[model samples]
Target chain A: PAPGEPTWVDLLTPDRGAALQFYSALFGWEFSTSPYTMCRLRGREVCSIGDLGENPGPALGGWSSYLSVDDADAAAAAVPELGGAVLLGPIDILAQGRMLLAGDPSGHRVGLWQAKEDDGIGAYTRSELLTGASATDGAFYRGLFGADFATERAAIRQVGPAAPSGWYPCFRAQESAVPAAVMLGASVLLRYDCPDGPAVVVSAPGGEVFTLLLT
Target chain B: PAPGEPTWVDLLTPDRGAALQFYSALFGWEFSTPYTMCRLRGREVCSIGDLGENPGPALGGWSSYLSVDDADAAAAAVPELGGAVLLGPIDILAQGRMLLAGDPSGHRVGLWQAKDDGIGAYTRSELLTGASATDGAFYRGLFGADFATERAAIRQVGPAAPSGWYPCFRAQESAVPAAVMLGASVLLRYDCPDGPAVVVSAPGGEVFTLLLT
Candidate 1:
């Protein structure tokens, strides 16, 4: 797994089968059965979902983005000193890989993965497209994860203090469910036609972001 | 957003002047007269707007936009999917049709039906919870694709899970070995049908989950 690059998008839902059904109908995604249910779109793995069962954590259901790192344990150790906090991990997933759950100083959850057989799933934006942040916070990630911060800045335009400070996903207009997303409660943050295309940045009421473009 | 790229960004702030100043200092972003459009490298990257004359319970933060083909259709789809249309499918002159909507969870996103075509922010991906699997299903209707799920109730290690987005990151290796760091307290570690999963809290008072896979 490459440092700083997003490797996966996963969920902790209260219901498992129903979550799969809804997403499958909406995104046209395909799925594979457990050990752990794996999700795919057009033959490419996009993300995996799990149930909170009855023991749902303090956190609710939604997407959690993972950034690839060389050492999950080391990264977990580094979080606190970096003004970030480790929520969970340095744990193992069978023969899969090592992982840690954490939040940066500003209170955002990010996943760190140290892969073995599973480098990661998905090549498209669902896994690659990360959330945005303040320029100051961007540097924090650069130092902590050894991420490509400058390249990241070039990729995501910055706004004021209200900007999100973590790694999420963004998409092209050729691929957006804005209306359905809107119906499901998403707010438009911005709309502009850049040199490349027309775009919008939307947020779920919970402050999660989803960006899209057309050209 | 050059075609499938994040093109535009805007901010909602209680103090527009202060917000502009903070961002300008942080990024050297050039501003338009009163601070509506913010530019970087000669292009408008983002803008800041006031909360409103009355500040009618609007959440303040940066809002991102995704380009679409038909604003009307997108705007129209909101309510049927278990969400609501809050603003307009009004014409932004020739820019496109703009629609603001709310997800079932209270997160807001704007939909744009571009007059032309294409591009794509959030900072982190967080763990989101819902009352039922239907909440995740609602997302399936919205985003329309991609994810894996389990059949049984998940485990928790720290505090009682809150219903919202929890930040997540992928680490290079395992980070929690002794569980001695921070104020982080593990509430539970469950061996599921597939593998081991744990939930814990960080010093910042946020809780999250970790899966081995």
Candidate 2:
């Protein structure tokens, strides 16, 4: 969670485990496996194309934003109101968490995650290890295929395969000082070492405030 | 490399055999693995990462393009270029490649094999699958990225991955009909069944032209 806007990046991976292991070793992350399905690396929950047992097509793979919501079902109901589709939503996995994959007007994919009790991989600020715990070292955070209203289905279709990993790495700094500061901490923690995908952020820089890192 | 364009997107993975195998499965490629060192997935060559084997900040990762006249010289020249230092280039052992780990522009990263060797990995386009290769799907194909150029590095890095993938998908109503007619076919997959992401060449779309799938 961020102090202001959401800083999210969906890493579409064909094999979440392959990416998770690669990044875990490179970043010194603690990728713990949950009881059910799903994995968490660098304190962030990593979504997988997951061998859905038998679910084929239906927009598989890749990562999408899942806003921290109070009710997954309630949020699913809100999709039509916003002029979008609730492709799928509110599938509770007992202790793991719930997810709602929806598309907005412009066709950007955003996931709605309602964690039962995980404070979420935790904030990555202590530039102490420079190896793991959390990630990102740049303010040039990559913006999602931004569609406050854009290519929704195309966005939905993009959720799988090796499309980059970890969090979006957003630097909530309108000021140029923020990316450096956050990166300093990330670098110190050794979390900035991205093994596969690109560590893009809002390098667009301006004048800003507090920064936030999410899953 | 597109003429007049900067080099972008280079792939680095932990498993060369797996990468070669997996990517081949996904893209329908034909790899030519020569017995050498470095690089695995390209079919021709592969790069190496620090991979924590050497004394550096972590290791075993890949970064692409910021170009240097000599990849061999890139190692020694990093310090002069800026702040990052070199971590030595290692051989991939049968992957037929070598790579350098150094700090360029202050970021500690990796490098790739020298020369533009089409001898290694290439697609099988009817016009250019090189004589008699039954499979080769990457060359002479239009590309598309999730993010637009001005705002993203789709074209800059690649049409896939951080940039995007090669023989990447394109969106063109004109090209779609032609490619399909000529049978270039749709490559990538999406969720929808009878959805809008239809891809085709133009029924008779010529080389280098493509449409979305």
Candidate 3:
């Protein structure tokens, strides 16, 4: 994976079971057992679901995207200088890799992943940073990675300053998946034409928002 | 409007021109500016202004205002009751005195001491997150004993949801499709205790729910 490309995506939810069931039905994803649940599509790892735990105070459950990096420690070190703060760690994720959680200057949450045996989820179709301060926030990411951060795999979107900022991940799925998603308890928030084609924005049963790019 | 009941709602945006155009078309709101006053059916209903006009940090979105008898006194009581005052009990000319604050659970709210009032399209505002008991106590302390039974301006969901004051307006179910066509993104749709509702975000990203009447 190239630096700054979306390497993985995951959901943090209080009810892992409900999230698992909802996503499984919508995306035809299967789950692997363990404390950290891995979501697999057609036998390949796609993404993950983790429990927010009982004492998840003031935590609004949602999906998060991780950008790939060559060296986790080096990336973490450069964060503060780029006007972003490292909120968690460049610590080891066991033997999988090293990871850290961070916030852009505007406080939008993001993650950085340095892969080892696992390269994280390469299956994601698109990852976009929707921010109120696109020029500044986009520059922070570009400084952390390189000028190439504005690729098709990942990009920055300018939204109104009044809008909440965060990374929104999109997945490519068949048009049939739309009806299946609604039937599986997802709410369609918007169905609009994107530059590429058409897409539907949906809120998972647990209130996590994501997009399904029609194939 | 009674104290503790939602009296008004307003938006703060970077591009007031775009916001004015969007809401005017979507809600049929007529705007009279200098400071934009939003009117529906010839009555002032809400407001919209440039983000720069705000004195403090304004979260770019629709803010719900609860009617209060005294904005200054209520602003003073905010911090003592586990909330933080974010803006002033400053006078809005002779129209009202107002202040913005955040509750214990971090939902931004407004208190309004009106020199007068109006009835518009805004129907209600509810707290979409935080524990009821926790949020209820903080609000009750500020509003009064009637806050518990009167179902004042704000309603809270049970434990386990996002935190924010969700404003709702009167509209038909058919408006959902039209709103999307007009550049509003539907945020959620659910069966409410009163009726069916759908949350939507305007082109500027301010969110509000449409009560399917």
lDDT-based ranking, best first? 3, 1, 2
Q: Is the docking of candidate 2 incorrect, acceptable, medium or high quality?
A: incorrect
Q: Model 3 chain A, poorest ten-residue lDDT window?
A: A52-61
Superposed model 1: Cα runs more than 4 Å off:
A15-18, A32-36, A55-59, A118-123, A126-133, A150-157, A161-165, A171-176, A183-209, A213-215, B1-213
lDDT value, residue A67 of candidate 3: 88
Better of 2 and 3 by TM-score: 3
Give chain B TM-scores in order.
0.54, 0.32, 0.85
State the lDDT of candidate 3 residue by residue for B41-119, as single tens digits: 7787788777533211123567888888998789879889998775666566599888888888777788899992222
The better-scoring model by TM-score among 1 and 2 is 1
lDDT of 3 by residue, A107-201 (tens): 77788999995222224587777666888898889998898787557877666655434787888877888898888888886665566657677
- Candidate 2 ranges with C-alpha deviation above 4 Å: A1-12, A16-18, A32-61, A95-97, A118-199, A202-215, B1-213
Clashing residue pairs in candidate 3 (N, C-alpha, C atoms within 3 angstroms): A162-B60
How accurate is chain B of model 3, given as a TM-score from 0 to 1? 0.85
C-alpha positional error of residue A177 in candidate 2 after TM-score superposition, expressed in Å? 17
Per-residue C-alpha lDDT of model 2 across residues B6-98, encoded as one tens digit per residue: 233333333345544433333334555312133334443333221211111121222333223344454454444442333334333353233
- In candidate 1 chain A, what residue range of length 10 has the lowest lDDT sum? A118-127
TM-score of 3: 0.48
Question: What digit string (tens of lDDT, one per residue) describes model 1 on residues A78-179?
Answer: 877787766555668786799887665555566788888522212235332233455555555777756664362124355555443344454444435667
- Better candidate number, 1 or 3, judged by TM-score: 3
Query: What's the lDDT for candidate 3?
Result: 0.73
Error in Å for residue B40 of model 2:
40
